[PDB]
């Protein structure tokens, strides 16, 4: 698992179509080795803390793992 904690300034990404709640989230590694790049996303600049939900089924209805980590 990736379980990535985000930092100062560090950009996380949330697909509006995939995710479960919005906090759900991805790291910029996991975002773009994933399915999401190509749905409607978003990007919310992290204050840091909190981690990335790559390969969490309960955070995302569509595509919950990244090419990395699959
Ligand atoms: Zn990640
Ligand atoms: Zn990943
Ligand atoms: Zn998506």
Same mark, same amino acid.
């Given at each position: 698992?990736?379980? #990535?904690? *985000?930092?100062?300034?560090?950009?996380?990404?949330?697909? #509006?179509?995939?995710?479960?709640?919005?906090?759900?989230?991805?790291?910029?590694?996991? *975002?773009?080795?994933?399915? =999401? #790049?190509? =749905?409607?996303? #978003?990007?919310?600049?992290? $204050?840091? $803390? $909190?981690?990335?939900?790559? $390969?969490?089924? @309960?955070?995302?209805? @569509?595509?919950?793992?990244?090419?990395?980590? @699959?």
């Amino acid at each position: 698992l990736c379980g #990535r904690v *985000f930092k100062v300034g560090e950009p996380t990404y949330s697909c #509006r179509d995939c995710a479960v709640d919005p906090t759900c989230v991805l790291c910029m590694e996991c *975002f773009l080795g994933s399915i =999401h #790049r190509d =749905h409607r996303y #978003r990007m919310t600049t992290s $204050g840091g $803390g $909190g981690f990335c939900d790559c $390969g969490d089924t @309960e955070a995302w209805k @569509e595509g919950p793992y990244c090419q990395k980590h @699959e």
